[PDB]
Structure formats: C-alpha cells, structure tokens
Write a protein that binds this ligand. Structure first.
Ligand SMILES: O=C1CC[C@H](N2Cc3cc(NC(=O)c4ccccc4)ccc3C2=O)C(=O)N1
Ligand SMILES: [Zn+2]
Ligand SMILES: [Zn+2]
Lengths: 26, 382, 802
C-alpha cells in the first residue's frame, strides 16, 4: 500500500513513510 | 553465475513484452548544427552504446515523444556539470527503439527504451512555450587514427605486418610469448624514429585493450574474450560505462574524441584504487572494487526504471558491508527475473543505498547479491 | 612567424625502388632508381652507371614498373604516387633536349575506402593488357591499357578475401590470371583468379592450394617454360603449378626473413634473395619443360637491402634504406664460401636521421647527424661535402662539448643470450673497440637484448675515446651537455628508464651526471626517479626533465646534487620539451601542444595556452616567442601561434600554417649560420635522409612570393601533369585542406632554370614593391635578383648527369 517513490516498497509503518520522505530529500 | 541467463536483464521484461520495435539508423553529419528536443526530467550521463529505460507521465512529454516517433526518433540528453542550475556544455543523442502506450488508471503512460548514439556540444539552450527545451547542437567527431607505423613503415616489410592468429585460447593468466613477438614485429620500424618500441606500444589500441581486459578479468573471473566488443571505440565506450567513477570523470571521458586517449584515461582510472563509501556520512565503507561482478550482459552497472518512472543506476556486488535491511522480500517489478528484493540503507545515516536480492529457489546461483545505486555512492581514491 | 619559407638543402638519399629495362632506347640497358619524389635514370655500361636524367615529381613514388605494349619501340614507365596520381611516361630525346612525356594521367582514388594494411600493390600483366592495383581491402582495381585511355579510367572488382598478403600476374596464361596469398581464421591459402575485361568480373582460376606455410609472404611468378608461382616463407620455399608441387626447407634461411627478390636469367633459372640482415642468397631452378628440384645457396654479405636488381654482367645493384647503396660483383670463384660477392661502388645515404647538432659556428657551421641502424649506423659530417664515420651499431642521440672537444653519443647494440646465462655480441662495434671502458654494474635463450652505451668521440679524428655501459634492462632516452648553477664544470647528463617485458609502463628511471676529464669518464651524481625520463633541457642554470606525465625543475647544489624546485602535473606524456627564455613547449605523441611559463618570483609553473588536436606528431620546435612549428601525421608541417587577432581566446593556439612536405621529420635544430629578407634559420632531418631549411618572411615578401608561385604554376610543366596545389595540400585520412602560410622554395628556385621568354611571361603585369616606395612594372632581372637571395640561404647542388 503506502510506499516510497525514490526507493522500493517501505510499508512497515506509517512513521516509516515520512521518515523515508525527509530521508530521501536529505 | 550458473543457470542464470545474463541476457534476461538486458531485454527489460519488467516493462513489457509486446513493445513496438523500430529497426533503423539516422546518423547526423560530422561538425553539423542541429536542433533536438531535450527530456526535462532525465539527469543521467548517457554514454554511446548504453540503454536507457523511461516511463513518462506528464502530458507534454507524452505528446513530444509521440511527435518524435515519426520525426527520426532522436532526443538529446544533457550532461549537467552541476544539476542545480541546469547548465551543460556537452551531451549525447539518444535513439528510440522500443515504445508502447497504456491507458491504466485513466491516464496515458508511454514506456520508451533508448540507446546512445552520438556526442555533441551545447551551443544555445532555447526554451519553448510548452516546457520542452530545444537545443542547438554541434555533432562532435569520432577520431579514427591509423597505425603509428603507417607514416614510417618500409614497403618490403608490409607483407610481414600481418600476424598469424592469436595462439590457442587461454583461460587464465594468459602466458603470452606472443605479445612480445607482436611488439617485435609490428613496431620493428621504430628504429627509424627517435622513440623505442614500448612507447609505441603505449599508444597501440590492441595492447591497451588487452591490458584493460586483463585488469577486468582480475576482478570478475567469468569474463570471456568474446563478451567485450572487438572495436576500440565500442570497447572504450563500454569500459567507460562500466567503471565506478563520479560525474566529473565521466564528463572528462566523454570530452575525449579519440579512442586511444579514452583507453589510456580508462587505464589510468583503473590503476588508482577506489573504495565505495556512503555519500551522506563519508565515513562508512560499503564495498570495494574486488566485489564488483557482472550479472548482466552489459557490465556490472546498468540503468533501470522503477514503477514510478524514476531511474536508478544499479551496481551489482557480491558482498556489502554495513547495510541495514528493512522489509520483506518481494518479487514485484524486479529488474532481475527470478529474484526478490529488500531495501537496504546505511547503518549510520539511514540513507537509501540500494537493495538486497535473494533468490526464490535454491538452485539459483548466485543465491544472493546486492545492488547499490550510483548516486548514493562516491569513489574514495586514497 | 605566420609566413614561412621551406627549401631543400639535401635531396633524399634513400632508395625505395629500382627497375631495369629499355627506357632511353631499344639498345640501351637502363637502371631506374626511385628515391622519395625523385627519379634517376642511368645507362648501364661496363665501368658502372652513367647518369643521364634526373627529374622531380609532385608526389611520393609508391609504384614504378616498366612495360612495353605492342607497336612500341621501347619501354614505357608507370608511376603511382601516395596521393593516387597515376601516369604513363615516355622518354624523348631531340638532340640535346631530354623530355619526359606524359602519355596518360589521372587520379584513381576512391572516395569511400579503407587503405590496406600491407600497402599499395601495383602489377602489370606480361602481355600488357591491364594494370592491377590493390589500394583498399576487398577491392581490386583494373586499368585497361587500350590506346584510347588517356584519363586512366578504372573499374572495381569485388574480392571476397579481405586480408591479401601478395598478388602477382602469371605467365603463359591465355587470359589475365592473378595468383595471390591471403589469410583467413583457418590459416594462409593460395588462390588464383581470371580477370575478364568484357564482363568486368572474376572467373575461376586454374588451381588452388592450402599447403602454403603460416609465414608465407612472397609470391614470385616464374616465366616460361616453367610457369607457376614460388611462395617464400620463413622456413620453406614451395613451387605451385596446377598438379605440380615441389617443397624445400633449407636450414640456412631459418635465421632471418627474406624480403626482396630479383630475376637473374630471362627464363627464370636463377633468382636473387635478400634477407633482413644483409645476406644474399641464390635460388636455382633445375629443369629436365618441367621443374625437377629447388636449390638455395649463400653468396655473401651486402648492405641491408630494400630492393635488388641484376645488371646483366654479374653486377648487382643493392638499394638500401638503412645504409649506403652498393654495386657488387658475383664471382664464379670465391674466398671462403661458394660464389662470393665483392663490393666495387658505394653511394651515400644519410637516412634515417634520428638526431643532429650544429657545431663550429665561429666562422660556417657544420652538421653532425646520427645515421643508419644496426651494422650500418654511422656519424655523418656535412659541410655539400659529407664524411662518414662507421660505428657498426645504432646511434641514437648526439651532443657537443666544446670545452672537452668531444661529442657525446648514445648508442645501442644487439646481443644474444647464450647458454651460460650471459650475452654475446654479433660483431665488433664502437662500444666494444673503445680506448677505455666502464660499466655501471656487472651482472650475468638465443633471444636478443639491447645494450645501451654512452660514447665519447674526438672532434678531430672521430675516434672512440671512452665507452660507458649502462645497467641491465636500462634504456637511455635523453642527453644534454650544459653547465648548472655556479659550478664552472660542464657535464654530460643522461636520462634513462628501466624496462621489463612484463611491465607496460616503466616505474623506475634515473638521471646520471658524467664529467669527462683526464682521459676518462667519471660519475658525479645519480638521482632515482619513479618513471621514464623522456626529455631533458637546460633552463637558466637549472635542469628541466620530463618525468612521465609530470615535469621536474632541478637545482644544482654546492654539494654536487640535484634538488627539486617545482612540480607541474599534466594529463599527457611530455615526450617533447623545448625552451625559449621563460617559456616551455610541451608535447605528446597525440599532437597535444602545451605552453608553460616559469614565474621566477612565485617559484612554480603556469599554463599560458594549449591546443589539443588528435593526430600523430613527430617533432616540435620554437620559432619565436609567439610561433611554434611541428610535424604532423602523414608528411605535413604545421605552425601554431599565440595571442593573434577575453581570456578564453588568449588560452587558445590556432593554426596559421599548413603544408605537405612529403617527408617524415625526426629532429629540429637551430642552424642559424650552417650555410652562412628572411629571419631565423631552422634545419630538420628526415627518415629519407633529406635535410631542409625553414625561415620566416615578412608579409610583403610572402605576398610577392605567393603571387609568383601562382604565376609559375601556369608555365612549368609537371611530370605526370600533377598540380602543385594538390601536391602541397595538407593531407590526413580524415581531412584535406589547401596549404597556407608556407612558401615552397623549390618552385621559387625553379624560376632560374626556365628560359627568358618564359621569364617574361611570368613577370608580365606584376607590380614590384621596391624598397624605394613606388610600385612599378617588374622586369625579369628584378625577380632574378630576388630569387638569388632565396637560393643563397643554403648551399647549391652539383650537376647530376654527365
Ligand atoms: O529490484 C527492484 C526493486 C527496486 C525497484 N522498485 C521501486 C518500487 C516502488 C514501489 N512503490 C509504488 O509503486 C507506490 C505505489 C503507490 C504509492 C506510492 C508508491 C513499488 C515497487 C518498487 C520496486 O520494485 C524496482 O523496480 N526493481
Ligand atoms: Zn524512501
Ligand atoms: Zn550513511
């Protein structure tokens, strides 16, 4: 379901989504 | 590499199987001025002979690619020196050889596969009203130089300039007792000049290619002599594509017009040892050049497209150090058929480094390997 | 500067072809010798060779053959040049007037094609029906020899074999038949074809065979009554004629490779063979209608032969590229072997010139060059008067020490590894027969190694006073003679490199400082470096040495040592290094020109300008502060200049001069007054043994000489009707361009050889910019006065014919 765009599926948690979001920009 | 067809990743089955294939060639004249459209989202340095997959979502690139389909199927990829300000002085010409349109999710999507053809110099960066950049382009030449002895050779020795075929195929070490004979016979006219035989060997395409092949076979033992191209220009382009170097070195290699100079530069690049580290921390080692191996017919580094059209340049390595694994294996949209993947991030800074590929079966070899993206790696030269 | 003047001081002396026939008349036996761009015609008499005619051609001669079609009283000459200019020439004599008449001419170049690896091959069939040319791989070019073909029109026939070694026309065939040897992945094969002029096609040949050995290179067509072909390889000689097969493997020819041959008897009973080391062989064919056996015997030693020719009385002409050409006599009896040869005449050859220097400039310079290779190596003193000093080994570099009254010469000799683990010498040479000897260090199958030596030679007697032998696997590359720092002594400085067969790039080298005093050579200091010392030069009391892709300025310490001052790292190999003041000119083999400047107050190097154009470059020189001269791929010369009318264009060197010379230049020297309007004087030496001069001209003189060139090209008749503009055009495989910025002094000096009416034709309606200021209609005498000076710049050639 919820997963990244600059990387593979990251659907472990709702927190993980935005963690990867600011992670990818940084 | 046993029971895995290395031709599988090259065909890009994950994109589709019923693509429309166009066979043809359109080579521009040398030192000619041309106007070519530019893809607005691509930020990759394409070397001639490399394959680029693309997924296009916005309507304007869809319409521009549709227009390009009957107008010689050529678009320009700009090598950005610094990607922030979008300034580029050199680029490459890409030809479309596979395309297909879908209507899923109520919007139109075009999938394109392209191959690099020619190099050029950026003159004028014209911008159109619809957001597609038109570029004034000067087509750079490929310099084919004759043998160094063609200006000095004796006519009586012209019949002896042709050698018997290279001795019975060796597999490792390659004892020569032939490269010595080849040096003695090909550059025998060197005593007519001021320079010795080995200096002329340092500018010989065949010897440079053999040295490069030996150094490549040192790291990956499954190379065969017929896997690499037999033409100096194609060989140099393939080697420049396969080397783990940063963007400035790739631009410098693209700026060279002669194949011999490119081969010499590539040998110089190979000689200096490199270690690949995480870019955000710059203090944790991921992998070394020794673990680089080629699971694909086109070297250990290739361009692939993820389900959202974003392009990653993946490097296939055997052993990866200091990588944390999060997620479960999944076979959806895998670039390597028969393998799943789990995302891998740097253990220290948690940045996305690549993926870990695990075989579903037990008869597959290699059972596991790691693929790391180039943009998250920097070459550390001690 | 941007306008230059090139003249020839010494004509080329290397022989690249020789033929025999009846060219002057039906009763005279003629020898035709092809030196570079020069054709010499001789009449063979009992006492030797009588020169008759000498002509210059607008091209490099690649093919020279003599043929006599039906209805012709005497032979005709076919010439093909490296720029693919073909002509058929006739000899005409009306009293004292000797003319070379062009019967047909044309250009046979193909716009699309790859030049063949084994060169240009030109063959004429025995019945004079067609000319066959192999210029590009996969194509065979046929020129029909009908009388109404004045433009030399040809057609192409497709060859399915791409790698052809040799091809010849066969004797005794009712149709034009060719026999050739080609290589495929399976090996080397011999095949025959029939050429049809009606269908412009290849037909099936009379036979075919595979038994040709893996190292077969020569095809010899045997005349009647034998017929067939003879294939020469490294260990075997084979005869093929249909179902006839004869093979011999003589042990004597295993030591070296046969490269040249010539027919002795008209019916092919005897042949002459020449190998790479100067041995002369005789091949004898025994008959009984058909061939019975093949025999090879050794005659003796001659010069290293490029071509051989028999002169119908036991006299053989040996044409050499690495040494002097000879006339030799074959005797029925002999000294120590069977059928020895005796030398009776020697002709001077200065090629190849690998280095030279200018000496004795107090008052009239002299030129000392390093000529020849292997056993023909020698020192030539040119004053033209030429003196020969035989060395019997290869000379590499030369320099002059005035305080010691001696020359420093780098040399190399070939030695073979014996069973003991050491090395043994093939012949006595100057390095082994020296008055005194020294070795850097003494150390311990049947393969050749190179031994490098430094020789001290007296300037008066040219006797070897000292020989110094370098280390094992050491290669000496550069040599200078200079004073350094505040030391009042003059030193010999040598830059070497350590070369091992398993290492592509040398990782070690050294710079050695020698002093010659009290009859002996002593080592003062040595410096170990991490690369090859390709070039060294003296720079304002400091030493400038090119260490691979970097350069290293060195200081001379009061402790007699070398201390590093500054390092500049480049991306190119510094093969060429020239200096003028505070400017350094750096170049590589790929024609990458780099200009550096030394900043004395900062103590480092700065980059001024550059020009990177991928080609093959053989030499560079600095003309003045702004202009630089070089030699290009093929046989061209170029001039680059600086600051000519932002920092982007100030860092760019652009081309102001292009010229096609026809020679391969190895060395540039500043011979200001070697031979005692023009500014500067630069000499160059070529592979062909040619010496030339380059000088600078002002704009007005350049314009006047260009106009005179254009007017002269309309009245001078060229041999083969070749255009001077096409001949002098800058030529590479990817680019052809007109010449600019260069004046051909040979054509200007030809003005004095023409008749007075032709002089008035040339000078008609020409404006003379006299130094007085007012322009007026020039007369012939004014231009005669002007050309005089242009000839005085160098010496004058003597008469050739009797
Ligand atoms: O080996 C591999 C693995 C890496 C790479 N990716 C990237 C990827 C993103 C995604 N998210 C998505 O669709 C998605 C869907 C809805 C909302 C947001 C995102 C799914 C699968 C993959 C996937 O497989 C690939 O294509 N090849
Ligand atoms: Zn992410
Ligand atoms: Zn990190």
């Amino acid at each position: 379901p919820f997963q990244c765009n600059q990387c593979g599926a990251s659907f472990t948690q709702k927190g993980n989504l935005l963690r990867h979001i600011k992670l990818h920009s940084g | 590499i046993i029971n895995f067809d290395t031709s599988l990743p090259t065909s890009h089955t994950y994109l589709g199987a019923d693509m429309e294939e166009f066979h043809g060639r359109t080579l521009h004249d040398d030192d000619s001025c041309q106007v070519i459209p530019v893809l607005p989202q691509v930020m990759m340095i394409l070397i001639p002979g490399q394959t680029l997959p693309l997924q296009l979502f916005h309507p304007q690139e869809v319409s521009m690619v549709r227009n390009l389909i009957q107008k010689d199927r050529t678009f320009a990829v700009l090598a950005y020196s610094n990607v922030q300000e979008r300034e580029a002085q050199f680029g490459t010409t890409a030809e479309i050889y596979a395309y297909r349109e879908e209507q899923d999710f109520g919007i139109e999507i075009v999938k394109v596969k392209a191959i690099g053809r020619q190099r050029f110099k950026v003159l004028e960066l014209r911008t159109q009203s619809d957001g597609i950049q038109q570029a004034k382009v000067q087509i750079l030449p490929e310099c084919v130089l004759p043998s160094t002895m063609s200006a000095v050779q004796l006519e009586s020795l012209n019949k002896c300039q042709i050698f018997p075929s290279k001795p019975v195929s060796r597999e490792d070490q390659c004892s020569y007792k032939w490269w010595q004979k080849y040096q003695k016979r090909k550059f025998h006219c060197a005593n007519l000049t001021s320079w010795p035989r080995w200096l002329y060997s340092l500018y010989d395409a065949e010897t440079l290619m053999d040295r490069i092949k030996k150094q490549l076979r040192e790291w990956d033992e499954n190379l065969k002599d017929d896997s690499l191209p037999s033409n100096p220009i194609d060989f140099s382009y393939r080697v420049a594509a396969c080397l783990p170097i940063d963007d400035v070195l790739r631009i410098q290699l693209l700026k060279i017009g002669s194949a011999i100079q490119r081969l010499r530069c590539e040998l110089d690049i190979m000689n200096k040892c490199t270690s690949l580290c995480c870019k955000q921390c710059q203090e944790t080692e991921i992998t070394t050049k020794n673990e680089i191996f080629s699971l694909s017919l086109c070297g250990p580094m290739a361009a692939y497209v993820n389900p959202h059209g974003y392009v990653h340049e993946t490097l296939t390595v055997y052993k990866a150090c200091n990588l944390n694994l999060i997620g479960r294996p999944s076979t959806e949209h895998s670039w390597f058929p028969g393998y799943a993947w789990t995302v891998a991030q740097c253990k220290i800074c948690a940045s996305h480094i690549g993926w870990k590929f695990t075989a579903t079966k037990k008869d597959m070899s290699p059972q596991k390997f790691w693929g790391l993206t180039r943009s998250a790696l920097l070459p550390t030269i001690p | 500067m941007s306008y230059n003047y090139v003249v020839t001081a010494q004509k080329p002396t290397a022989v690249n072809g020789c033929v025999t026939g009846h060219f002057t008349s039906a009763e005279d036996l003629n020898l035709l010798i092809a030196k570079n761009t020069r054709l010499e015609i001789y009449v063979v008499t009992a006492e030797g060779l009588r020169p008759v005619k000498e002509v210059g051609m607008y091209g490099k001669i690649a093919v020279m053959e003599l043929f006599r079609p039906k209805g012709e009283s005497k032979d005709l000459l076919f010439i093909l040049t490296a720029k693919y200019n073909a002509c058929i020439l006739e000899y005409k004599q009306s009293g004292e007037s000797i003319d070379i008449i062009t019967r047909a001419h044309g250009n046979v170049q193909d716009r699309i094609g790859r030049p063949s690896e084994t060169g240009i091959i030109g063959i004429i069939d025995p019945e004079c029906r067609m000319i066959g040319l192999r210029l590009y791989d996969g194509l065979f070019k046929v020129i029909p020899l009908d009388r109404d073909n004045k433009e030399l029109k040809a057609f192409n026939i497709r060859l399915e074999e791409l790698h052809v070694i040799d091809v010849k026309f066969l004797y005794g065939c009712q149709a034009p038949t060719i026999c050739f040897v080609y290589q495929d992945p399976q090996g080397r094969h011999v095949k025959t074809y029939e050429v049809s002029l009606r269908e412009k096609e290849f037909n099936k040949g009379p036979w075919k065979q595979e038994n040709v050995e893996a190292e077969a290179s020569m095809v010899i067509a045997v005349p009647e009554p034998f017929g067939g072909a003879i294939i020469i390889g490294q260990e075997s000689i084979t005869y093929h004629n249909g179902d006839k097969y004869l093979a011999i493997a003589p042990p004597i020819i295993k030591q070296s490779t046969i490269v040249c041959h010539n027919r002795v008897d008209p019916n092919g009973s005897r042949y002459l063979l020449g190998d790479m080391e100067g041995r002369l062989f005789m091949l004898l064919l025994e008959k009984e209608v058909t061939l019975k056996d093949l025999r090879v015997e050794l005659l003796g030693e001659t010069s290293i032969a490029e071509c051989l020719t028999y002169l119908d009385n036991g006299v053989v002409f040996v044409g050499s590229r690495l040494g002097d050409s000879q006339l030799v006599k074959l005797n029925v009896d002999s000294n120590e072997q069977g059928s020895y040869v005796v030398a009776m005449e020697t002709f001077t050859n200065l090629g190849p010139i690998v280095d030279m220097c200018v000496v004795d400039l107090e008052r009239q310079g002299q030129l000392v060059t390093c000529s020849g290779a292997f056993k023909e190596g020698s020192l030539r003193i040119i004053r033209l008067h030429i003196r020969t000093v035989p060395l019997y080994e290869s000379p590499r570099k030369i320099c002059y020490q005035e305080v010691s009254q001696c020359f420093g010469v780098l040399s190399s000799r070939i030695e073979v590894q014996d069973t003991s683990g050491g090395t043994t010498a093939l012949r006595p040479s100057a390095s082994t027969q020296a008055l005194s000897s020294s070795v850097s260090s003494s150390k311990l199958f049947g393969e050749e190694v190179e031994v490098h030596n430094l020789l001290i030679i007296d300037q008066h007697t040219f006797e070897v006073l000292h020989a110094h032998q370098f280390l094992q696997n050491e290669y000496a590359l550069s040599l200078v003679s200079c004073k350094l720092g505040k030391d009042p002594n003059t030193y010999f400085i040598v830059g070497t490199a350590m070369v091992y067969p398993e290492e592509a790039e040398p990782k070690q080298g050294r710079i050695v400082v020698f002093q010659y005093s009290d009859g002996k050579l002593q080592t003062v200091a040595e410096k170990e470096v991490k690369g090859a010392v390709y070039s060294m030069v003296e720079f304002n009391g400091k030493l400038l040495a090119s260490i691979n892709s970097t350069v290293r300025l060195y200081e001379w310490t009061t402790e007699k040592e070398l201390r590093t001052e500054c390092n500049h790292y480049n991306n190119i190999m510094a093969l060429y290094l020239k200096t003028k003041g505070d400017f350094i000119l750096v170049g590589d083999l790929m024609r990458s020109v780099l200009l550096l400047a030394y900043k004395p107050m900062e103590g480092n190097f700065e980059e001024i300008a550059r020009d990177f154009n991928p080609n093959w470059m053989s030499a560079v020189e600095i003309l003045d502060d702004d202009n630089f001269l070089g030699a290009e791929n093929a046989f061209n010369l170029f001039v680059c200049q600086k600051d000519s009318a932002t920092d982007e264009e100030r860092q760019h060197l652009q081309e102001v001069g292009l010229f096609h010379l026809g020679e391969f230049v190895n060395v540039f020297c500043h011979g200001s007054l070697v031979m005692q309007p023009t500014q500067g004087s630069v000499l160059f030496g070529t592979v062909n043994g040619m010496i030339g001069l380059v000088t600078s001209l002002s704009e007005s003189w350049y314009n006047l000489l260009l106009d005179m060139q254009n007017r002269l090209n309309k009245v001078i008749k060229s041999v083969g009707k070749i255009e001077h503009s096409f001949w002098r055009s800058f030529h590479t495989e990817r680019k052809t361009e007109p010449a600019t910025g260069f004046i051909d002094g040979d054509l200007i000096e030809s003005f004095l050889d023409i008749s007075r009416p032709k002089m008035q034709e040339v000078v008609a309606n020409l404006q003379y910019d006299d130094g007085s200021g007012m322009k007026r209609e020039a007369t012939a005498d004014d231009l005669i006065k002007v050309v005089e000076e242009l000839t005085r710049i160098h010496w004058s050639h003597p008469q050739f014919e009797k």
